Amino acid sequence: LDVELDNWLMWWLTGQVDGVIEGAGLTTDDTDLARLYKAIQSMTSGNLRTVVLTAASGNLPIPSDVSVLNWVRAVGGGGAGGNSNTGNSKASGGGGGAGFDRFNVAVTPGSNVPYTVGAAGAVNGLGAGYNGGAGGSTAILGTTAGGGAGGLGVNNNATAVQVNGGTTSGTTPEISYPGGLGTEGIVGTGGGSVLSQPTQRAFTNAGNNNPANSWGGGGPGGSDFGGAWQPGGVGKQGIIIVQYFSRFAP
Amino acid sequence: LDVELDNWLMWWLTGQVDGVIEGAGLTTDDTDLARLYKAIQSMTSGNLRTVVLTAASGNLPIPSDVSVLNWVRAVGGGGAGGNSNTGNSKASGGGGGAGFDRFNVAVTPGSNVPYTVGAAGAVNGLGAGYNGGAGGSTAILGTTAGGGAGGLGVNNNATAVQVNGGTTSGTTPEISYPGGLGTEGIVGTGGGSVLSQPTQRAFTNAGNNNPANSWGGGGPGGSDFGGAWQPGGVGKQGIIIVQYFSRFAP
Amino acid sequence: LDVELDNWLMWWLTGQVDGVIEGAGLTTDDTDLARLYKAIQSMTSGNLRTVVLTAASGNLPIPSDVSVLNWVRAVGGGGAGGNSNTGNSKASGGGGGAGFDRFNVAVTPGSNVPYTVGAAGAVNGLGAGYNGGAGGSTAILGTTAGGGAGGLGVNNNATAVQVNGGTTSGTTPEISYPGGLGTEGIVGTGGGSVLSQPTQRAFTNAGNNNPANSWGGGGPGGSDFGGAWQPGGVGKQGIIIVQYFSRFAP
Amino acid sequence: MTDKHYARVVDGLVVETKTLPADFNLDDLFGPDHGWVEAPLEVEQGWRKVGAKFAPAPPPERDPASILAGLKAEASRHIFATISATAQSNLLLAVGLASAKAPSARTPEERDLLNVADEGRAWIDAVRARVHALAEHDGVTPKGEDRWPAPSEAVLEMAAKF
Amino acid sequence: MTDKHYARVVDGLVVETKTLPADFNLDDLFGPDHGWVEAPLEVEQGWRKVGAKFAPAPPPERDPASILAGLKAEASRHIFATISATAQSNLLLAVGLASAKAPSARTPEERDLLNVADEGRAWIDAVRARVHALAEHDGVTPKGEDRWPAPSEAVLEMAAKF
Amino acid sequence: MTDKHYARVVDGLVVETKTLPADFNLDDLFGPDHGWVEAPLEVEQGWRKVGAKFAPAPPPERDPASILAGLKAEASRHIFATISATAQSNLLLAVGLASAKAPSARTPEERDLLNVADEGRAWIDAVRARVHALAEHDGVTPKGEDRWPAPSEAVLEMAAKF
């Protein structure tokens, strides 16, 4: 054993061990002797920063120490329901947005590929018998959950036909949930999504217009009883959920 | 290099390295040379103790080594549906309970803030045309998922009105799932929750009363056909799901 | 202190510290001084290999280093809906498949217990009024999510009866999602599942037969209007989702 | 030690009741604003909140208009139940075209069915009048077979033939 | 090596079949209690389990009451399809008002429509009788145009006017 | 820096529009094939793609058959709304049984009912004719009370009594 070799070995050991301590952002105390099991609780249980993105377009700031995102879940926008004229036929509810989730996706430190969430389908309630708007698509890291299609305008005594829900495109996610398709109209319920549930139409003569419960849901379409003119519920925009381990604040 | 300085340094290193070994509860073997890669497989993949709480009120025992709870998911109770009289109109199904889930929530070692799960809405089946009870709310760590409201009793030839689902209050969770609202009654389907699916009414003359499938669901409400007296299905209570890393038994 | 005692101590220290380096599959660089925080990112956030199984029967190859599977989620197959004759009554949609998910399940290195996913219930559309097939059950590690029962065939002016959804059997999962039961038929919607949503019937005279949206869903059952002969949508097969930490490729 | 019986008052109305040990902290569990207040054990779900008093649920409103609507709807589909729509059309066409010819030239069965329709109209009118004259009694015994008297043999005969 | 064909028998009924390699352990895969038993390849879904034997699915029950119900329902909505409800009401009011006056004073169109309604009721009665007398034939050819004979030109004319 | 206005064209139809900063890479965000193309800010959802041009949405097709169907259906359920099905049956039975006897032997109330039915059918026929002769006007004022003229006091009297 060389006089310098063992010194180099112990220096390497002491530089290896502590790098974890500030790896998760802790002081190199020489008395505690545990240090959160060497920052291990903080690096596995703690530091699990979760970010919810709802802006229509923006750049996610990835911290320097982050190299892999895990459990990126996204949901496309939802489509509004169709309007109902002053007749008897029901309106077709808009289809809910699709969604996907991925795991262990790799991201370089620095700025992120810009997320874009899908805006909710606005109600085309400016006139009777108008098909509602279609919700926008949600795209991130080359994977897109397309927004659900809108409802369908309905004339007298002719109920509309069902509309397609969302889909998934781009790099294939490990798991994808196609969005609930909007219904033909007699049931009229709007389609659900990953984070939402199929909402039903509300029978009223004032156009109460119950929207979809949560993100990605589709409007339940309009209805007409006793001269009612309910335009149909509005959809809900999609969100992006990401999780990563980092000592920095989210 | 002092004669005692290097001795202290190696003592610190050898007391640092093993603290992980019993940190996850393993023997300090000096022959294995791996020791679960420093107990890492054991306290990252293993030790993931999951606890499901269903008691109406109790104190969750937090193990001493636990300092951070991750993925606390809670669902409020569901509400039963209204009864149906011996007429022709339809009862309104009860609304499903809301829910939420949180990540990286901090908890001091010792006892926990008492969880209280929401009891399922009992059926107000004492007679015809009575609205069912509303499910209880589920509260933990300052966050509450309110129970879905009960159904509405129905008279002859006048279908009931839809009822609101649950909501979320307290400290804002990262992801909140508003409960599926109960329907006005012609569809009559009960509201769903995070863990439940929207259940539909069962047409029978004996009152089979299919309840909500799983936790947080809402009863599908009663119905009448051929002189039937279906009271409407009962709701389902909510549960609390928590996960944490600990070498101790759950 | 013995002359060989400290040498043995430092040898043990260096062995313990560098075992982790190839624990995540990395070279023992003497210049990095961090080794990706001892590769603990790649050992907790990285190496999170996710496997989706859809084959009807096969052996999951468990890598040597894997000893603990976490978050094994399975969904049983869905049942197709019943056909509709050229009368006036409605068919009953098939019941959705159940599902479950477990955490921290222990698996020995080597081969795995053969997963078997449930094939989707084929449509018994060879004739009118015939009940659809029932989807298969999904079994793994002693836990089974039974497939949802099929729909019911319908004759003239007599709507069918609802069918039970899937269940869960074997070793009790700590979270289980009973499948959405197929409906009696006027609504006719097929039951949903963990990853699917309740899909509705589509009014058409061409038998477009909209199937369940995603895995575990049940067919929305046949329909009949204006002499139509819609047999009812087909169910969707179930999948198994597993996750584990391993330096090897999935 | 005792257990408090809290109730969540919303708009002066109780929507949910719980029973928790008194050592808990409502703020630390339900969050900053909860609406939970201590209530006596007698308090149930769906109770009025007048002042610092827990009033019981008010009795349901008695609507005579609802009584009449239920009475009529109960007797509304009954005419289509005893005699189907297709049977109704058959009887109406038969009686109308039978009346289209002179009574002298009418066949004996035509007179028979005309008479049968006469007692059928009498029975229907009597049932309707009795159903109108029931709001003051609120559908109590005499009710049912008394609200709906047994139709004559001619009624069942015409129901069977068409 | 061969593949065992297992079936999950519930209450003597096969509800699901699988084909798995024989080296598997059913208990170690499906849990403690499963209900899976070895079955011959000919066994299909929906089969009786009579003792140690897989009987084929029993044939569906033949209900004459169901036959009559279907025959009537098929000819039930047909009257409203050929002649709408509004057209039915129009013709009924027209014939009732035409019969309200003496046959001598009736306008020529009034007797024309009276005769047309006469053939209409004759056609309707014939169709109803033929439909009723079909359970012994179970709706086989002669069927359709023979079950529902072509209405006369008067029928289409009265459909056209109202 | 300016924001591009992209649109996702499917089958020559714009189904979704977005506004994103120009520095983005559409391929690296939406995957290999996306269908997003640059469009002018005037482009809205639901627009044609003809050549290298975003044509505006074509106007909805005007169908005279749809106009007639809506006109008839609007006046279809109105007869069942002003006079219920059971009230219609009551009036039809009354007129049929009244016409079954000689006008000389008819009771004064029977004659009154016959007259009331006369003006009732006159009003119904007038309403039907006016509704039919409205496609050239597309249901514009004179409309409503002019499409559906006020029924006489006899109409409301027979509606109330039966």
Author numbering:
A (entry chain C), B (entry chain B), C (entry chain A): 31 to 280
D (entry chain b), E (entry chain c), F (entry chain a): 1 to 162
Give sentences copied directly from the paper behind this entry.
Here, using a minimal myocyanophage, termed Pam3, isolated from Lake Chaohu, we demonstrate that the chaperone gp25 forms a stable complex with the tail fiber gp24 at a stoichiometry of 3:3. Each gp25 subunit consists of two domains: a non-conserved N-terminal β-sandwich domain that binds to the TNF-like and glycine-rich domains of the fiber, and a C-terminal α-helical domain that mediates trimerization/assembly of the fiber.
The residues from Leu31 to Pro280 of gp24 were modeled to the final structure. Seeing along the three-fold axis, the gp25 trimer covers the distal loops of gp24, making these loops inaccessible to the solvent. These loops located at the distal of tail fiber were proposed to recognize the host; thus, the chaperone gp25 should be released prior to the maturation of viral particles. Each loop has two glycine-rich motifs (GRMs) that adopt an elongated conformation.
